[PDB]
Design a protein around this ligand. Structure first.
Ligand SMILES: [Zn+2]
Ligand SMILES: [Zn+2]
Ligand SMILES: [Zn+2]
Ligand SMILES: [Zn+2]
Lengths: 371, 376, 378, 378
């Protein structure tokens, strides 16, 4: 036995309980007693290796992306999904130079645009991507997708009104048409869309990601809405950036009982370890704790739920035996901490989640001397 | 002191004396040794021995762009051992291009850094591709300056293609950045808003006027059909002129008119892309473009010079490559001049039937035999 | 779109040539007005050639070559690396060589932790350590399972000189075979100067395993004391044991090969044992085309040479139908070769020469539907 | 201004004082704001150090078994620049450079190991084996080709000179030292369990050469028969021979360290011998900050510990003024630490333990002008 974690509280997302037991690690697998290394996790909660489902981590190919193996592991994140940073032109290089050598397990959505989001970033000198259906290379998209079905979960398209404010057709209608023909899912930046929520939501199906559901910049999900709630119960999964979160939509929607199925960060160089809006995934989870979301439901939105969407159920996002030894050891801390949205509205919280140790593929990649 | 490779019985091309030398070349390691007996002996009987050719305008950011090729795959078997990427990458994707292509590659690649954020990553799929954004409103100077300063051992300057409602002029803004950051420029300058008489006034010694024989819009010829005075004056000062025979950057009428008036390119290159590599009758390879110029009345030792010594100078590598002299890097291309009817095409469709073509039979790169026909 | 016109297809199954045109769309062959037309008049149109024992972990080993550079011009588009990498460096080999390369590369994982990284630079190189006491069974198992799509088994080099003197714990062959059996995989073994006789040796091999350097003729060959192929060697080939004539610089003997082919024993795989020392350099190995041309001038039928570098290894690489064939929907890996007439000498390990009269000369190479080598006139 | 760190305390290594001051970062450089941003870091009650420098780490991950990725495990504990102590040799250096050094955020210099494969054979448990240091296998043409084509990164040659390694044709130290001198560079030597004595072995060291594991006490230590530091050792530090304590799991003796410091011999450089086995794990090595804390609790002044991990290593990497300093126009490599009071155990090779009452804890890390680690509450 290579590592043992003793004296901790395991969060059992299945039953909403805290289990008093040790974790066993041999190789890169959690197993079911002497151990070469013993971790003392007293007062800590043992979580599965966290999964940030909407990030941008094609560093070197874009200006906005960060290296997840450098900034995410120390805050408990061991797996990520890239939200269409790459397109068919640069996906293979993204896979060969980032995904394959990274320790953070990275999945991805292929962007409709061929170069992805490489044009945004670097400040205001950056420019928006070209979402014109006239420049969709369907032959290359299908080729990239079919040769990489084990890493690309779907197609990513950003549908903000400003990206197209004179195209041949509507970028959504054309994308969703491609997605259906290619038998795959879609993920849509919906902030400031040309259509209203009651109209866009008719284009989504079981497995598709309606991202930044709580944005409220333009047509929000509030008049809440009944077609969105129907789509959520049909199988449509529902990313705080610097502009894609509004407290008024979030407080209202959750007051009415609507909850996001996935919590993400839209992690960028601009909002990594730096704002009161994103900072880290833990910071984003901590806001939902102080916004009334139940703890075991926050944990589900960053472990079990995305790990099924990445088609990795039982492999990650769980502390079961035979799972990858991806463990995040956190302590819930009581301190005054402020959360901000797009409009500048603040919320003063009483607690935040602080990561004290990270184990990735059975290796101690992060461990404070004293938790 | 035991030699590693000897190429014997070949005709060595001395570009400086414009003559051939009948002697053997010695190689120990990755260096050329003076043989004024080895592990491996190559018989260049009936062959001309060139230094490793240098393609000065190719696009070789494979993986990061849609138009590039891999030089290690398609360029070594046709004699080319060094290359310069003409702005495939911008400040966003350069360091990836240098880490994932340049550093692992064998073909020595120097580069020009495009001013656009993403370089030329945006064109390529065919009709679905689209042109790059040269808006000076999107020039990240602090990023361009950071990329240039941290990689002055590789970036020779900035590339711009000069052919929406921008803020400034791309060429004026770029030359301003180029001059401010104290480096050189390279301009596509095909279908330009200004006549060649005006545009050339901003070029300096070591700058690159690319696609000089393009003949699509304002060419290097006046309405009388003669090479502009300032164009000739520019080359006298030190401005470099490069043909880069693309699929739409070469016209027969302009090229034929310039060389009869005594205007010969300083650089012969290809604008090599996956579309024009080993495929067309316009930019088939560097040897195909060189062969086009032999069949055009360009002296042999001038065509070689335009792909060996002139580029090796502009990449700040005099004596290291582009030559077969002692202590040079062992980049050797062994060729035969073969006689056969071969047709060259231009952007307009005009055709020229030629008599011969250059044919590579062997390539030594960094002292290693990377291409060697069994019988030359 | 590429169409290759006026060519001759080799049919390894029906052992005849066929005048037909090959069609390319995307990266796959289709069943036949194209963007690019290639005049292959007076040419044999082969599948992309497959070199089964090469050493291609460049950057990590001193002996390896970059297959994208030196192999594609000679018709080879797929290769298998005969154990240059061990469990220590396989992932680096896969990420820095295999994934970005254009030549499709499967591999055998060396049983030694670091592989053959110590075996180059000339005489200063030294033999790898095949002591079973230094096998990391857990790391070998881990590397195999997390990469079962690219690793076809374990590679062992089993010369007397490797273990001679160095007092190893157990016998490397018995240990590596035991591990290969326990791990439900296959083995590939350098057999040159093996301690055991071929009749004894071959009793450890099973269907799908590789007997590398079958014509090595240094020590215990596949010939008995009267010059005949052992009946056990012959029975093993029938069971499924794949015999491979890896033409090293010291792994081929004309007297053993000629005898074996006189008695009807033909190697199932023709390969090079390609290293930076024997690539484009010698008279023993030079290219895959060179080694095949030796067997052509040695009496082996052409359609059986072609199969031993196409259909057979593609099956062992578990890629049947995608490569090693020109059938529709296979990957567009195409080699255009010409049968050239010229005096050519082939040398073996001891210096025995054979003056042949023909060799195969590659003229154009298609890889993943892309022209990557094309003589302007061939 | 991009980043300013308010309310901290720089540590002046020259004047041996602490100054409450602010740090300004623009782009990737520390700017001078001494006479008056986009992000403000509250460093209340923290010591503002430069990015720490670990001088003997093993970070050729992928190509070795003992190496860690410094980008993952070293940045969050304050390290932004490292030197690899001969994990790679001439065979695998360029792959080490292209696949780790070039793409890494941590700035990694290196020493080339005289062994061809470096330390790739080490680790993975007891199944690993010692590298081959026989001078008969030194490839001097390749070592010289590698160094001279990579002199901006290779600071010298590394040899591990223990008896258990060579227990050969010539003495590896004598041969290595000679090669170093002929090649005109510096050397670095694991001086643990060596054949020669400390006074005898030090006579081969010039200025800029590293005497690794100076406090090892395993076999021949820097202490004579009377428990006193050798005069020739003391004379060498005067000349400019750098003594690095490293540490690791077997190269640190508490008796030797305590004696040699009681007589005024303090190590010029403090490092870890960081490996996959001693990273974040033992009570011996754990991190640089853990090792520095052991030296803090051992009676070493704070400015000397900080110097031995800031200025002194940055000098031997030929990078004075770019890293290891907070001066204006240095690389924006900042470490923000607190000196926590707590009961912490320190262990040495032989098991001897020393209980301390403090240790350094890293709360934020800035690398090349980017926040790569920042606790929400320091
Ligand atoms: Zn996004
Ligand atoms: Zn161009
Ligand atoms: Zn072999
Ligand atoms: Zn060490």
């Amino acid at each position: 036995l290579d590592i043992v974690i003793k004296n901790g509280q395991i969060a059992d997302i299945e039953n909403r309980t805290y289990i008093n037991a040790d974790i066993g690690i041999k190789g890169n697998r959690i197993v079911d007693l002497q151990a070469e290394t013993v971790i003392d996790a007293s007062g800590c909660i043992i979580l599965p290796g966290l999964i940030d489902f909407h990030g941008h981590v094609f560093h070197g190919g874009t200006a906005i992306s960060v290296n997840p193996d450098i900034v995410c592991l120390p805050n408990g994140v061991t797996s990520m999904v890239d939200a269409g940073s790459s397109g068919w032109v640069n996906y293979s290089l993204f896979r060969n130079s980032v995904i394959h050598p990274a320790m953070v397990k990275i999945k991805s959505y292929l962007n409709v645009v061929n170069v992805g989001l490489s044009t945004l970033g670097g400040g205001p000198t950056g420019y928006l991507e070209n979402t014109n259906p006239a420049n969709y290379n369907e032959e290359k998209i299908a080729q990239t997708l079919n040769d990489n079905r084990d890493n690309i979960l779907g197609l990513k398209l950003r549908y903000s009104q400003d990206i197209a404010r004179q195209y041949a057709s509507d970028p959504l209608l054309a994308t969703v048409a491609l997605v259906r023909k290619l038998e795959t899912s879609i993920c849509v930046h919906v902030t400031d869309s040309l259509l209203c929520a009651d109209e866009l939501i008719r284009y989504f199906e079981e497995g598709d990601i309606y991202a930044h559901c709580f944005h409220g910049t333009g047509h929000s999900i509030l008049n809440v809405y009944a077609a969105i709630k129907e789509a959520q119960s049909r199988g449509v999964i529902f990313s705080n950036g610097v502009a894609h979160f509004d407290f008024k939509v979030a407080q209202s929607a959750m007051e009415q009982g609507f909850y996001p199925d996935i919590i993400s960060t839209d992690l960028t160089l601009r909002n990594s370890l730096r704002t009161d809006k994103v900072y880290s995934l833990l910071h984003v989870m901590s806001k939902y704790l102080n916004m009334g979301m139940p703890f075991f439901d926050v944990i589900r939105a960053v472990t079990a739920t995305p790990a099924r969407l990445m088609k990795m159920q039982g492999q990650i996002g769980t502390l079961a035996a035979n799972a990858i030894a991806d463990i995040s050891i956190v302590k819930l801390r009581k301190d005054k901490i402020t959360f901000e949205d797009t409009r500048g509205k603040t919320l003063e919280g009483d607690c935040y989640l602080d990561n004290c140790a990270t184990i990735c593929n059975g290796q101690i990649v992060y461990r404070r001397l004293r938790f």
